[PDB]
Write a protein that binds this DNA or RNA. Structure first.
Length: 162
RNA sequence: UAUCUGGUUGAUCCUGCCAGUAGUCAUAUGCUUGUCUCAAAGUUAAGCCAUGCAUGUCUAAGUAUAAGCAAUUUAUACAGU
């Protein structure tokens, strides 16, 4: 089921005549919890506009992930596949699958990517600068997925000819 | 298996130093001061030290205080070898 969960805003000050106006740069993470996530950021005048702008554009940039059973475990049960590192600016996000019962251990940016992907038991690490709007979230989205980042290892054999 | 924030700007992103968040100490100081168990308690002048105490024990190593000889002390059923 599609869950919209809001991360944060910054109040973006623009200098204009007589005084400043505001604009809001909103971050909303979409996900299914079965095995899809969604990245969306856009701006607007008000907070009420910016949230809706981040909601809709996240449903374009939908990423499948290999988690869960189809029949047999084609995705890893309640965890990520392998480990993946990924840079995006002066920012790195690193990942590791955990055993079951651990729960979702992560930074508050990457946490709502993982739980809305359905990924329960993981440890998650960032290093360096953490710039939450842009860099860590972009880095985590290119690290977590199937189209980006992870491969399972079944699809690795399916793609060549046996 | 490792999550950073604030301060150089009109604003932004880097570089970079500083300040703060944590855990710890034979502890010390301000303040308040109600208990217990366990553990610890001169880091400075290996500086100068009063007084009392920290090193003794055996008579089971011997003559063997009879036979013979001064004085004093202790023990007993009687000898007290």
């Amino acid at each position: 089921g599609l869950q919209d969960e809001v991360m944060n805003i910054k109040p973006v000050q623009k200098q204009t005549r007589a005084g400043q106006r505001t604009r809001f740069k909103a971050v909303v993470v979409v996900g299914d919890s079965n095995g899809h996530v969604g990245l969306g950021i856009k701006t607007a005048k008000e907070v009420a506009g910016a949230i809706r702008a981040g909601i809709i554009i996240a449903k374009l940039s939908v990423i499948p992930i290999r988690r869960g059973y189809w029949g047999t475990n084609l995705g890893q049960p309640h965890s990520l596949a392998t480990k993946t590192t990924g840079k995006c600016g002066s920012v790195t996000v690193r990942l590791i699958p955990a055993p079951r019962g651990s729960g979702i251990v992560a930074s508050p940016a990457v946490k709502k990517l993982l739980q809305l992907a359905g990924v329960e038991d993981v440890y998650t690490q960032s290093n360096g600068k953490t710039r939450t709007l842009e860099n860590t979230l972009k880095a985590a989205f290119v690290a977590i997925g199937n189209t980006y980042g992870f491969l399972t290892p079944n699809l690795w054999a399916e793609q060549p000819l046996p």
